[PDB]
Amino acid sequence: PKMKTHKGAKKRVKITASGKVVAMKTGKRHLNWQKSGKEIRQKGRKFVLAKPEAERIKLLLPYE
């Protein structure tokens, strides 16, 4: 039958215009009292997944 979108990926990740795969930086959900300002700030941004894992995730979002 036709493929299904992996909703887990669809809820965590984005495909940019050029097919880059971006997600939020890990490690900020909690335990922050003693995390520096810099660290909490830099983790506030998105980052581009490494090519191997990126291209695995794109397969999961086929109608994207």
Partner RNA sequence: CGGUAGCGGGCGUGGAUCCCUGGAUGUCCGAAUGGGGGAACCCGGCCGGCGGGAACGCCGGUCACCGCGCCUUUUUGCGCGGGGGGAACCUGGGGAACUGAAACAUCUCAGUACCCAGAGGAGAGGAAAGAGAAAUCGACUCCCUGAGUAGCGGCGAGCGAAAGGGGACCAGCCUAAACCGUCCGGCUUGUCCGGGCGGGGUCGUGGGGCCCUCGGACACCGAAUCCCCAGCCUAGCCGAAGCUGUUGGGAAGCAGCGCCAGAGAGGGUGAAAGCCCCGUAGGCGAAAGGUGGGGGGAUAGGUGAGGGUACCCGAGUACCCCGUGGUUCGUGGAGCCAUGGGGGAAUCUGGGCGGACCACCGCCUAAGGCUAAGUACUCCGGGUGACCGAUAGCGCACCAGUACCGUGAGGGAAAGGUGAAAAGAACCCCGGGAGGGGAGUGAAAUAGAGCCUGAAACCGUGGGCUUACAAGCAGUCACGGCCCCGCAAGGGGUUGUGGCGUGCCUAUUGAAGCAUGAGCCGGCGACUCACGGUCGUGGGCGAGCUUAAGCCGUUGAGGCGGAGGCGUAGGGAAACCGAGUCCGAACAGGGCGUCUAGUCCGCGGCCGUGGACCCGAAACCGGGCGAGCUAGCCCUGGCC
Partner RNA sequence: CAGGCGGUAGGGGAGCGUUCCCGAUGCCGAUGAAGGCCGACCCGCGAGGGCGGCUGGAGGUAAGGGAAGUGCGAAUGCCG
Partner RNA sequence: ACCCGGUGAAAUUGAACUGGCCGUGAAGAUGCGGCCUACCCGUGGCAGGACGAAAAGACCCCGUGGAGCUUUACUGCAGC
Binding site for RNA (CB under 7 A): 1-8, 10-11, 14, 16-20, 22, 44-46, 48, 59, 62-63
Q: What's 49's DSSP letter?
A: P
With respect to RNA, which residue has the nearer C-beta, 7 or 51?
7
Q: Residue 24 contacts by C-beta under 8 Å, 6 or more apart in sequence?
A: 12, 46
Question: What whole-number distance in Å separates Cα of residue 12 and Cα of residue 25?
Answer: 11
Report the partner that residue 23 touches, choosing among RNA, Mg ion, none (CB closer than 5 to 8 A by kind): none
CB 63 within 8 A of CB 5: yes
With respect to RNA, which residue has the nearer C-beta, 11 or 33?
11
- 27 touches Mg ion (CB under 5 A): no
